[PDB]
Symmetry: D2
């Protein structure tokens, strides 16, 4: 017609997690064969971005707060939106092994459903905002699964002192996630303590807004990462802890990744 136009496929999966012992939800956007560049048709090695949500969000957050499905509609990229509830992408002290579920089970589930997604590091990426920025860097440092990793307004440094002081949720919550604050192993949850064992083959990007409550956290964390020689680029701009800025950062991410992003025309 001229009236007709493509769309990515939108897939919502509910599956049984053996790790968590419960039904879990994951959303997947999958490229539109009729709209990607000609060369990409039939691909058996499609690149994949895992995009992680913030505290209070879920598998719908990115899709509803950005117009990601519109942005990517001409691009050869699978995007996976997992859920972690309020568990920080962490195996918690109350027995929910969210990190194991994210890092070990989810990729196996997806591969089993979707053999044509890439299994290559050079085509596997992660990013997230807020709690999801912590999750993205944690997963990339520990797993060496990703070529590129990004944090937007991430909680990239913390301590008991900062978590609680009880402006950021109460003690029982934080100790449920990370263990008791007197446990000498608490520090294993600190991203700075995970750099040494990572392989140094992941590119990192971090952003934070000047006005964000986590701006000081990011300044401190990046300084510590840079001291250890992490391959990181850090940027800042005016902004707060809000989804408009996360949308902007998604659009920066899409150009940074090696995905041949087909940016929509904008005449106004």
């Amino acid at each position: 017609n001229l009236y007709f136009q493509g769309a990515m496929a939108s897939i919502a999966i509910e599956y049984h997690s053996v790790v968590l012992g419960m039904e879990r939800k994951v959303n997947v956007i999958y490229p539109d064969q009729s709209e990607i560049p000609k060369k990409d048709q039939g691909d058996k090695d499609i690149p994949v971005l895992y995009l992680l949500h913030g505290m209070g969000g879920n598998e719908n957050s990115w899709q509803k707060r950005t117009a990601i499905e519109r942005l990517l509609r001409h691009t050869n990229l699978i995007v996976v939106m997992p859920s972690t509830d309020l568990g920080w992408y962490t195996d918690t002290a109350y027995g929910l092994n969210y990190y194991r579920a994210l890092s070990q089970e989810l990729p196996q589930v997806l591969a089993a459903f979707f053999p044509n997604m890439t299994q290559k590091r050079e085509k596997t990426f992660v990013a997230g905002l807020s709690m999801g920025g912590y999750g993205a860097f944690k997963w990339a440092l520990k797993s060496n699964r990703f070529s590129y990793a990004a944090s937007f307004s991430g909680a990239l440094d913390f301590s008991p002192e900062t978590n609680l002081e009880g402006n950021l949720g109460e003690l029982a919550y934080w100790q449920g996630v990370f263990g008791q604050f007197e446990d000498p192993d608490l520090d294993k949850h600190y991203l700075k303590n995970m750099v040494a064992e990572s392989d140094g083959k992941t590119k990192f990007y971090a952003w934070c807004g000047y006005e964000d409550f986590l701006f000081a956290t990011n300044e401190k964390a990046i300084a510590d990462f840079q001291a250890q020689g992490l391959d990181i680029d850090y940027h800042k701009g005016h902004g707060k802890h809000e989804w408009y800025y996360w949308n902007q950062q998604l659009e920066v991410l899409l150009e940074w990744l090696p995905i041949n992003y087909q940016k929509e025309e904008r005449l106004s």
Copy 2:
């Protein structure tokens, strides 16, 4: 926490349409009691915008192609996203009474589920893009239900000559929607022929991009509407038949409507 933030409620309804004789889907976004201005808490007369999709879309289109759920999250507005398949919001010649289903049944269904939505014209609005711009103006002209109506890149004028010539879909399709092209009643589907009987108490807005295939259609249609004294404001800018521009127009619409839109802060 400072980490926590609200969200609108997102409601997906599947219901039995007696008019269409089938299960139908409608999405509704409903304002977050914890985030709207104080005065709006407990409202029993909440304003409502019906937002109509384009050819090939459905009840998910606006939500996935704009970040409407983010934009409206501090605003006291219900938004309803109906579906019409490829039926043009029209009672078709193949027996699917989509116009009756939209104009008569859907509002009764919604009121029955949601008694706290407004029943007032001064708080009831419609808009749509492409086919949905035709639908929005048709519904507003015929029903007098709305105070404000908006069309974005709408198919606001047409004839056999323009539909088909077969660049815009084939004959059987168009005649299925509007009837045989030799029927002397074809012209009842033309928006210009619906102005006389409307009550003149609806404000109209139309937009079209210069580069759009429907730019000439809109120029012609608005000239005809203005000749009949319709209360319409018409604007144009650079743009094509694409969702980025429809997102921009949604943001213009939200300020135009009498809804006390709480626009998100944008520091960059």
Copy 3:
């Protein structure tokens, strides 16, 4: 725990149909690796049942009206639930090519998403109820894609005389689906006229309740099929045009198909 138990994966897909020129929905239930018999783990040739809905239904009908997701949870079977609106799995006279979309596009879409589903006739099955029984037999007769095909209370014979006489919907509806009733090609829609060209390598099953308004239709249709030597088994019982009986027939179907159905224990 003993408290934990598996579930099939439930997948909801929205995809762009090039054939129909619109976003379409298809549901897929996919076997639980942790619950199927040991031997089936890792299968790259998983059997597939397409299950078609009735007039007024959609891709959710089977899942919500039967407890299919519970019944199949130990069985190595993919089940696909397509949607055809009110189009009878037919390329209609108003330009919606539902048959092409079902028979050609949908299998290619699914294979592209899900390479581990079978591509073998011996592991590919179809069934449906009411309109979906017509669709199941039509698709199996025309395509030779299936080893087994089943109709439950199907509209397996019809004419203008029976459609309309206007007890079963009005003329414009029926002629929109099948063309004008005076067209000499109307009879190409009759299943009896499709037997000659089918390959005779599909097993057919049909059921109808004695009290159903289509009981006479089924008696006539099966007699005509049996006259042509179709490989069909036909059964009847007390019942009407209702989902309880369709649930019962699903359970009969699951034993008939060569799928090694792992029937749940029922101690009461």
Copy 4:
């Protein structure tokens, strides 16, 4: 047509929980105005059943494992399916206040969306299976909101000794839900300790299968309830910890409740 038939409306709601500080999902089935008995049309006091899931389930469990949407389609009943993750409908020791969210917030959310649901005890009911049987009895004992409450294979008695011994999940899990096992307040989670303060105006029903791992638990719990004079009827049959039996018990529940259940005809 005779081909057309009604359906209940199926509503999926995602809403912001202030209590939990996260987006939460609740499903609602709402009666079909065209199919309920004549007298019920226009009701502003529609009865409501809350139906709670088991460990590992969610808001979709009842709908997918029973054909509840089919069973209730002629009946004037709203059914609400909440989610509690693995939190036992309890304000947990890791800071997720699931009980407050269920008992205080959810009813206010639903009333705000759906003013025509009843606010009367005589028309408000709860039931659940496994963990959800514990939840149903807990909520009914504490709140006095319900006239009728039902448990199917519920975990109605427990201790450290039985939880763990580590056949039923590990220590960290159970202590995350209920607190440390040495806390003298552990016993506040025991349903037997909640009877004294309840008002004695709720009717209780419990079922358990003989072969279920919780059969001894139910025998013990009911004996303790009967010693305290609770108004309870307890039944047992052959069965295990499986959804087929929960489906059977749902069908018993529907006749027990004062809802004028319109049971589907079953001629076979």
